[PDB]
């Protein structure tokens, strides 16, 4: 039997508008004694209930059980600790797994937008690059936009640990050299802990 | 018993000046019957010898054995297949693991150098960004330089799979806003399969 505990989605914890949850999963649960008890403690105090919810699932020749605890945005950011205590009769003692947002002195990220290279103009499409760096923790999110709709073609690299214990990352928005020379403006959006409203925007235009 | 087979170092396979090797490792080797036989086959034909070399190692309460086959640069790039056949008397049948450079139609990467943002000038240091994209396979390498010495402060992100099955990546060289305004020139170096000499260089300067 194994118990995997999962953290909320970065973007959920950063917008009060959303809902962030912590997912506790259990695998290899005796096909014989499938009964399973879950315990949830925030910082140390059980919330067993706290609108916590699961449901059985027969798999392998074994069973799988998911439990989901809804978290409070400020609770998560203010670094509360969450614990999942799974107990089963076909198990010696129960298993406990804890989790909490990445600990550490927060750093406000610096967002830089860079136009395409003077050389990439040869090509039909061009790259709009967003340099985001100096942030901590890693939990971050970046999206592009041209107006009341989000640009579709763009990939963002994962966070890379820099030399100053801080992370950086680039996001690259592919756009038809046309839309770019025409004059349109694109925006690099960033939702991070250390931002004023956990949010910020940087513009880009011919 | 487990057998892990490792590929050469990207940068070794790209410079005839270097030496590339394939490393076969074995773990959990009966502390009782430690005798171990290794077989190496290139494309299918054994090279057992081919200047292949190993040496015992007592660990855990078990044993660990490393074997190293030297490879031919063109052999590796031209996609030859390498197989490691480890046999032991305390094992039913022997174990075989094979490996070969990442298969697939090669793509010449496009290298773009971008100066720091008009906004990052506020800061004491600045970022020189090298956009490398459109390459395949991932096996790649990027280094910075200012003259007869390689710049020390710079991190490169891992390869990110784009929307066109091709990879891209950014490299960021931190430099004192001084050295940059003074007039120095920095160079983004790239060693990739699909490059003329598996190499190319792009410059950057005020
Ligand atoms: C017995 O069978 C199990 C199921 O395997 C099945 O076999 C295949 C052929 C199909 O028939 C499928 O039905 C199924 O794959 C064997 O695998 C199980 O155990 C392994 C580890 O031993 C586990 O891998 C771990 O995955 C972790 C990340 O995924 C989370 O873990 C559970 C484990 O069951 C996964 O099912 C979930 O994906 C889970 O992720 C969360 O899922 C919930 C519910 O959907 C979501 O709400 C969350 O958002 C999501 N969180 C995330 C990922 O953000 C990983 O961290 C860890 O390192 C392992 O890699 C398999 O996931 C699990 N099988 C599955 C996919 O159900 C099992 O090994 C067999 N028995 C033995 C011999 O162990
Ligand atoms: C019994 O003990 C083993 C050793 O553990 C020891 O315990 C600690 C407390 C210390 O006392 C140390 O002495 C040592 O860590 C247990 O671990 C061993 O097995 C695991 C997997 O079960 C293995 O992890 C795998 O690592 C892979 C990558 O590393 C390669 O694999 C071997 C495995 O032994 C490693 O030793 C090497 O790092 C190897 O990498 C290559 O190494 C050679 C030789 O140095 C180099 O020439 C190559 O350049 C290098 N190639 C690379 C990495 O590019 C990984 O792919 C895989 O997914 C696993 O994660 C451990 O590495 C191995 N222990 C070590 C580090 O020696 C073992 O599990 C115990 N028995 C049991 C119950 O399995």
XYZ file of C-alpha atoms and ligand atoms in Angstrom:
560
model
C 0.000 0.000 0.000
C 1.262 3.433 -0.988
C -0.126 6.933 -0.301
C 0.603 9.832 -2.659
C -0.328 13.356 -1.509
C -0.797 16.087 -4.145
C -0.714 19.919 -3.897
C -3.265 22.345 -5.481
C -2.782 23.855 -8.908
C -0.493 26.938 -8.753
C -3.011 29.057 -10.649
C -5.776 28.041 -8.234
C -3.956 29.175 -5.146
C -3.192 32.534 -6.752
C -6.742 33.681 -7.666
C -9.386 33.983 -4.938
C -11.819 33.405 -7.800
C -10.671 29.762 -7.959
C -10.749 26.642 -5.777
C -7.595 24.967 -4.570
C -7.426 21.392 -3.285
C -4.994 18.868 -1.854
C -5.358 15.334 -3.235
C -4.481 12.245 -1.231
C -4.269 9.016 -3.245
C -3.907 5.405 -2.113
C -2.770 2.465 -4.192
C -2.522 -1.285 -3.598
C -5.391 -1.519 -1.116
C -6.095 -5.152 -0.165
C -8.762 -6.447 -2.521
C -9.731 -8.385 0.630
C -10.040 -5.704 3.329
C -10.911 -2.659 1.131
C -12.288 -0.597 4.039
C -10.186 2.582 4.345
C -10.176 5.477 6.831
C -8.803 8.966 6.004
C -7.659 11.668 8.398
C -6.844 15.256 7.447
C -5.064 17.681 9.771
C -4.320 21.351 9.018
C -1.150 22.431 10.828
C -1.963 19.775 13.390
C -5.647 20.140 14.009
C -7.832 17.584 12.263
C -10.444 18.814 9.841
C -11.452 15.251 8.959
C -14.698 16.840 7.753
C -13.644 20.277 6.433
C -15.752 19.332 3.431
C -13.359 16.455 2.713
C -14.500 13.970 0.044
C -13.523 10.472 -1.433
C -14.988 7.365 -3.291
C -13.841 3.716 -3.884
C -12.350 2.363 -7.157
C -11.563 -1.270 -8.110
C -8.449 -1.606 -10.285
C -5.439 -3.878 -10.824
C -6.792 -6.732 -8.691
C -6.416 -4.115 -6.004
C -8.208 -0.894 -5.030
C -7.592 2.833 -5.412
C -9.043 5.611 -3.238
C -9.062 9.342 -3.758
C -9.755 11.946 -1.070
C -9.870 15.683 -1.699
C -9.514 18.454 0.857
C -10.474 21.943 -0.183
C -7.924 24.497 0.934
C -8.067 28.184 1.814
C -5.981 30.405 -0.452
C -4.453 32.422 2.382
C -4.068 29.187 4.328
C -1.989 27.692 1.575
C 0.115 30.782 0.836
C 0.666 31.527 4.531
C 2.301 28.102 4.529
C -0.100 25.954 6.555
C 0.804 22.255 6.734
C -1.595 19.561 5.546
C -1.478 15.930 6.673
C -3.206 12.831 5.266
C -3.543 9.816 7.597
C -4.794 6.717 5.807
C -5.663 3.729 8.020
C -6.569 0.181 6.946
C -7.252 -3.040 8.839
C -4.942 -4.973 6.492
C -2.133 -2.636 7.492
C 0.127 -2.669 10.591
C -0.059 0.993 11.527
C -1.570 3.722 9.351
C 0.413 5.792 6.865
C 0.919 9.561 7.084
C 2.030 11.945 4.344
C 2.256 15.722 4.856
C 2.612 18.601 2.413
C 2.871 22.425 2.382
C 3.661 25.089 -0.240
C 7.420 25.349 -1.023
C 8.970 26.958 2.053
C 11.263 30.002 1.726
C 11.762 33.778 1.570
C 9.552 34.944 -1.378
C 10.960 36.920 -4.305
C 9.002 39.193 -6.633
C 9.703 38.168 -10.220
C 10.966 40.695 -12.791
C 9.103 40.480 -16.125
C 10.802 41.470 -19.361
C 9.278 41.335 -22.821
C 11.664 41.063 -25.767
C 10.766 41.538 -29.472
C 11.908 39.007 -32.083
C 15.528 39.043 -33.285
C 16.513 41.299 -36.151
C 17.523 38.037 -37.835
C 14.360 35.997 -37.333
C 12.505 38.474 -39.527
C 13.553 36.431 -42.527
C 11.056 33.758 -41.430
C 7.276 33.932 -41.843
C 6.581 33.669 -38.128
C 8.409 35.365 -35.280
C 9.037 34.785 -31.568
C 7.949 37.090 -28.793
C 9.979 36.236 -25.689
C 9.032 36.908 -22.085
C 11.901 36.807 -19.638
C 10.635 36.209 -16.124
C 13.290 35.986 -13.442
C 14.264 36.495 -9.813
C 11.289 34.673 -8.351
C 10.775 32.240 -5.483
C 9.092 29.874 -4.968
C 8.787 28.143 -8.329
C 4.995 27.898 -8.274
C 4.335 30.290 -11.158
C 2.156 30.838 -14.265
C 2.565 32.757 -17.547
C 0.017 33.295 -20.373
C -0.062 35.439 -23.535
C -2.846 37.623 -25.031
C -3.614 40.075 -27.876
C -6.935 41.495 -26.673
C -10.094 39.919 -25.262
C -8.749 36.512 -26.280
C -5.604 34.597 -25.253
C -2.938 33.915 -27.879
C -2.920 30.222 -28.679
C 0.621 29.511 -29.966
C 3.143 29.692 -27.098
C 5.164 27.376 -24.880
C 6.762 28.166 -21.545
C 9.833 26.427 -20.234
C 9.887 24.990 -16.719
C 11.531 26.962 -13.877
C 15.328 26.794 -13.848
C 17.253 27.336 -10.622
C 19.641 30.239 -11.103
C 22.932 30.996 -9.368
C 21.277 33.110 -6.667
C 18.876 30.443 -5.455
C 16.214 32.226 -7.470
C 14.357 30.835 -10.489
C 13.857 32.280 -13.960
C 12.041 31.014 -17.053
C 11.177 32.053 -20.570
C 7.897 31.958 -22.409
C 7.862 32.071 -26.183
C 4.837 33.248 -28.154
C 4.897 32.341 -31.849
C 3.124 34.929 -34.057
C 2.798 35.550 -37.796
C 5.383 38.165 -38.692
C 2.341 39.924 -40.173
C 0.355 40.471 -36.979
C 3.616 41.755 -35.477
C 4.548 44.294 -38.156
C 0.927 45.342 -38.556
C 1.146 46.798 -35.074
C -0.719 44.525 -32.677
C 0.178 44.423 -29.012
C 0.664 41.256 -27.037
C 0.839 40.827 -23.312
C 2.868 38.539 -21.079
C 0.813 37.730 -17.957
C 2.362 36.423 -14.754
C 0.643 35.097 -11.641
C 3.070 34.633 -8.822
C 3.108 34.646 -5.079
C 5.405 37.662 -4.728
C 3.402 39.886 -7.075
C 1.210 42.724 -5.894
C -2.049 40.934 -6.642
C -0.189 37.732 -7.306
C -0.406 39.186 -10.768
C 1.336 41.430 -13.259
C 1.365 42.200 -16.943
C 4.030 43.291 -19.425
C 3.296 44.507 -22.965
C 4.957 43.942 -26.356
C 4.357 45.750 -29.640
C 6.235 46.709 -32.818
C 19.199 -7.450 -10.069
C 18.758 -4.418 -12.298
C 20.746 -3.200 -15.333
C 20.854 0.493 -16.256
C 22.355 1.453 -19.637
C 23.625 5.025 -20.139
C 24.289 7.079 -23.315
C 27.421 9.227 -24.008
C 27.597 12.902 -23.162
C 25.970 15.036 -25.913
C 29.040 17.258 -26.177
C 31.288 14.208 -26.569
C 29.434 12.802 -29.522
C 29.525 16.178 -31.267
C 33.307 16.852 -31.260
C 35.671 14.347 -32.892
C 38.212 15.776 -30.453
C 36.377 14.010 -27.602
C 35.608 10.459 -26.464
C 32.076 9.166 -26.194
C 31.065 6.106 -24.176
C 28.044 3.997 -23.302
C 27.827 2.953 -19.643
C 26.150 -0.248 -18.516
C 25.497 -0.501 -14.769
C 24.305 -3.422 -12.650
C 22.814 -3.270 -9.184
C 21.759 -5.871 -6.617
C 24.259 -8.539 -7.654
C 24.120 -11.547 -5.301
C 26.694 -10.981 -2.582
C 26.934 -14.786 -2.874
C 27.504 -15.413 -6.596
C 29.184 -12.082 -7.570
C 30.649 -13.448 -10.825
C 29.210 -11.415 -13.725
C 29.533 -11.685 -17.517
C 28.980 -8.725 -19.900
C 28.168 -8.807 -23.598
C 28.191 -5.804 -25.927
C 26.711 -5.864 -29.429
C 26.799 -2.983 -31.935
C 23.745 -3.143 -34.203
C 23.748 -6.871 -33.589
C 27.349 -7.887 -33.884
C 29.139 -8.439 -30.590
C 32.174 -6.340 -29.825
C 32.528 -7.924 -26.382
C 36.132 -6.701 -26.575
C 35.927 -3.448 -28.585
C 38.092 -2.057 -25.804
C 35.253 -2.686 -23.341
C 36.133 -2.261 -19.647
C 34.625 -2.939 -16.092
C 35.614 -3.580 -12.369
C 33.823 -5.008 -9.249
C 32.425 -2.919 -6.342
C 31.023 -4.126 -2.980
C 28.139 -1.983 -1.705
C 24.803 -2.277 0.111
C 25.335 -5.892 1.197
C 25.225 -6.407 -2.535
C 27.521 -5.659 -5.485
C 27.709 -3.063 -8.249
C 29.463 -3.449 -11.614
C 30.284 -0.869 -14.234
C 31.214 -1.609 -17.850
C 32.140 1.040 -20.400
C 32.094 0.713 -24.172
C 33.835 3.370 -26.192
C 31.751 4.492 -29.137
C 32.544 5.917 -32.562
C 31.184 9.415 -33.142
C 29.818 8.665 -36.607
C 28.597 5.326 -35.280
C 26.547 7.041 -32.637
C 25.191 9.846 -34.831
C 24.434 7.480 -37.720
C 22.153 5.815 -35.185
C 23.858 2.486 -34.485
C 22.216 0.372 -31.771
C 24.131 -0.744 -28.687
C 23.174 -3.723 -26.525
C 24.376 -4.767 -23.055
C 23.865 -8.427 -22.064
C 24.640 -9.074 -18.410
C 24.665 -12.732 -17.316
C 24.942 -14.135 -13.777
C 24.770 -17.640 -12.323
C 22.366 -16.453 -9.605
C 19.999 -15.314 -12.335
C 17.479 -17.320 -14.419
C 18.304 -15.962 -17.853
C 20.542 -12.961 -18.528
C 19.275 -9.399 -18.846
C 19.517 -7.275 -21.998
C 19.188 -3.505 -22.321
C 19.675 -1.663 -25.629
C 20.151 2.010 -26.447
C 20.671 4.313 -29.466
C 20.699 8.090 -30.048
C 17.167 9.613 -30.154
C 15.671 8.439 -33.446
C 14.082 10.931 -35.874
C 14.370 13.353 -38.803
C 17.053 15.911 -37.708
C 16.371 19.650 -37.625
C 18.969 22.413 -37.804
C 18.439 24.783 -34.886
C 17.974 28.534 -35.439
C 20.079 30.659 -33.056
C 18.946 34.126 -32.038
C 20.750 36.467 -29.676
C 18.665 39.108 -27.909
C 20.006 42.122 -25.940
C 18.646 42.933 -22.474
C 15.246 44.629 -22.133
C 15.026 48.398 -22.266
C 13.554 48.027 -18.774
C 16.177 45.808 -17.156
C 18.702 48.606 -17.587
C 17.570 49.989 -14.259
C 19.356 47.066 -12.572
C 23.115 46.733 -12.079
C 23.368 43.514 -14.061
C 21.643 42.626 -17.311
C 20.544 39.491 -19.174
C 21.790 38.430 -22.568
C 19.329 35.896 -23.987
C 20.027 33.259 -26.612
C 16.966 31.849 -28.307
C 17.727 28.478 -29.846
C 14.828 26.770 -31.567
C 13.617 24.404 -34.272
C 16.004 21.594 -33.428
C 15.728 17.814 -33.205
C 16.842 15.692 -31.486
C 17.127 17.270 -28.048
C 20.767 16.321 -27.510
C 22.180 19.854 -27.573
C 24.724 22.182 -25.898
C 25.039 25.966 -25.455
C 27.914 27.994 -23.906
C 28.738 31.717 -23.664
C 32.039 33.608 -24.195
C 33.565 37.122 -24.320
C 36.967 36.334 -25.837
C 39.587 33.670 -25.139
C 37.694 32.758 -21.971
C 34.141 31.465 -21.402
C 31.669 33.672 -19.534
C 30.989 32.154 -16.141
C 27.524 33.466 -15.153
C 24.816 31.820 -17.291
C 22.159 29.129 -17.018
C 20.427 27.284 -19.828
C 16.954 25.856 -19.563
C 16.261 22.262 -20.574
C 14.771 21.502 -24.019
C 11.034 22.145 -24.285
C 8.944 20.308 -26.865
C 7.249 22.857 -29.099
C 4.020 22.593 -31.078
C 5.788 21.365 -34.220
C 7.471 18.374 -32.617
C 10.625 20.464 -32.530
C 12.457 21.659 -29.412
C 13.581 25.134 -28.390
C 15.406 26.467 -25.331
C 16.808 29.668 -23.924
C 20.170 30.402 -22.403
C 20.604 33.433 -20.193
C 23.985 35.063 -19.619
C 24.115 37.457 -16.664
C 26.583 40.347 -17.183
C 27.400 43.588 -15.366
C 25.496 46.337 -17.139
C 28.962 47.916 -17.320
C 30.688 45.321 -19.494
C 27.618 45.540 -21.745
C 27.488 49.317 -22.209
C 31.268 49.514 -22.429
C 30.999 47.664 -25.715
C 32.119 44.077 -25.196
C 30.858 41.312 -27.434
C 29.550 38.009 -26.188
C 28.921 34.860 -28.133
C 26.260 32.177 -27.891
C 27.788 28.834 -28.947
C 25.695 25.862 -30.020
C 26.792 22.292 -30.697
C 24.052 20.289 -32.287
C 23.643 17.356 -34.578
C 21.976 19.299 -37.396
C 24.609 22.040 -37.521
C 27.198 22.322 -40.254
C 30.089 21.214 -38.064
C 27.699 20.245 -35.325
C 28.550 23.775 -34.343
C 27.552 27.395 -34.770
C 28.047 30.750 -33.140
C 25.917 33.876 -32.756
C 27.231 37.225 -31.488
C 25.838 39.900 -29.147
C 27.115 43.420 -28.514
C 25.795 46.859 -27.525
C -1.742 -2.392 -9.608
O -2.324 -1.557 -10.632
C -2.071 -0.148 -10.458
C -2.834 0.567 -11.555
O -2.240 0.252 -12.828
C -3.185 0.058 -13.837
O -2.675 -0.773 -14.893
C -2.777 -0.230 -16.231
C -2.287 -1.296 -17.188
C -4.219 0.190 -16.515
O -5.067 -0.950 -16.453
C -4.689 1.241 -15.493
O -5.939 0.847 -14.941
C -3.662 1.423 -14.366
O -2.551 2.176 -14.839
C -0.560 0.090 -10.509
O -0.207 1.499 -10.587
C -0.531 2.361 -9.546
O 0.631 2.540 -8.699
C 1.664 3.366 -9.286
C 2.853 3.339 -8.351
O 3.069 2.036 -7.842
C 1.122 4.770 -9.515
O 2.168 5.649 -9.983
C 2.431 6.768 -9.200
O 1.778 7.907 -9.792
C 1.937 9.103 -8.993
C 1.117 10.217 -9.642
O -0.244 9.793 -9.898
C -1.032 9.717 -8.738
O -0.967 8.420 -8.140
C -2.098 7.547 -8.415
C -1.650 6.133 -8.126
O -2.704 5.209 -8.359
C -2.597 7.716 -9.866
O -3.648 6.793 -10.126
C -3.108 9.144 -10.088
O -2.784 9.585 -11.400
C -2.501 10.084 -9.042
O -2.633 11.447 -9.476
C -3.746 12.123 -8.991
O -4.933 11.460 -9.454
C -6.133 12.050 -8.903
C -7.305 11.155 -9.290
O -7.453 11.064 -10.700
C -6.280 13.510 -9.375
O -7.411 14.112 -8.698
C -4.990 14.313 -9.071
O -5.038 15.558 -9.758
C -3.722 13.559 -9.498
N -2.547 14.226 -8.970
C -1.580 14.627 -9.790
C -0.800 13.554 -10.539
O -1.292 15.813 -9.950
C 3.425 9.467 -8.889
O 3.581 10.602 -8.051
C 4.231 8.290 -8.320
O 5.642 8.596 -8.372
C 3.948 7.011 -9.118
O 4.491 7.131 -10.426
C 0.019 4.670 -10.560
O -0.527 5.960 -10.786
C -1.090 3.703 -10.101
N -1.962 3.419 -11.229
C -2.874 4.299 -11.637
C -2.452 5.296 -12.707
O -4.027 4.315 -11.208
C 0.050 -0.593 -9.303
O 1.450 -0.359 -9.274
C -0.233 -2.099 -9.409
N 0.229 -2.764 -8.205
C 1.513 -2.719 -7.855
C 2.347 -3.960 -8.136
O 2.033 -1.734 -7.320
C 21.377 -1.626 -2.168
O 22.215 -0.450 -2.145
C 22.234 0.284 -3.386
C 23.231 1.411 -3.206
O 22.716 2.350 -2.243
C 23.699 2.842 -1.382
O 23.141 3.292 -0.137
C 23.483 4.642 0.260
C 22.887 4.873 1.631
C 25.001 4.819 0.246
O 25.593 3.936 1.191
C 25.568 4.533 -1.156
O 26.652 3.618 -1.057
C 24.491 3.958 -2.088
O 23.607 4.992 -2.505
C 20.814 0.767 -3.693
O 20.762 1.720 -4.792
C 21.147 1.337 -6.070
O 19.966 1.008 -6.843
C 19.184 2.159 -7.240
C 17.926 1.646 -7.906
O 17.403 0.530 -7.211
C 20.017 3.048 -8.152
O 19.221 4.139 -8.665
C 19.111 4.227 -10.049
O 20.035 5.225 -10.520
C 20.042 5.324 -11.964
C 21.129 6.320 -12.364
O 22.396 6.001 -11.738
C 23.033 4.885 -12.305
O 22.648 3.672 -11.654
C 23.602 3.152 -10.686
C 22.853 2.192 -9.793
O 23.718 1.625 -8.818
C 24.268 4.293 -9.887
O 25.132 3.749 -8.897
C 25.075 5.196 -10.825
O 24.979 6.553 -10.408
C 24.568 5.043 -12.262
O 25.014 6.152 -13.059
C 26.186 5.941 -13.775
O 27.256 5.680 -12.853
C 28.489 5.348 -13.532
C 29.490 4.896 -12.475
O 29.757 5.924 -11.531
C 28.973 6.541 -14.380
O 30.128 6.131 -15.153
C 27.847 7.029 -15.327
O 28.212 8.286 -15.885
C 26.502 7.180 -14.600
N 25.438 7.389 -15.564
C 24.659 8.464 -15.478
C 23.758 8.585 -14.256
O 24.633 9.338 -16.344
C 18.654 5.754 -12.462
O 18.646 5.787 -13.882
C 17.575 4.782 -11.962
O 16.267 5.285 -12.313
C 17.674 4.609 -10.441
O 17.300 5.818 -9.795
C 21.176 3.591 -7.328
O 21.990 4.411 -8.151
C 22.016 2.444 -6.734
N 22.922 2.991 -5.738
C 24.028 3.642 -6.091
C 23.924 5.150 -6.268
O 25.112 3.082 -6.249
C 19.962 -0.458 -3.950
O 18.642 -0.063 -4.292
C 19.946 -1.309 -2.671
N 19.241 -2.551 -2.926
C 17.965 -2.543 -3.302
C 16.931 -2.877 -2.237
O 17.602 -2.286 -4.456
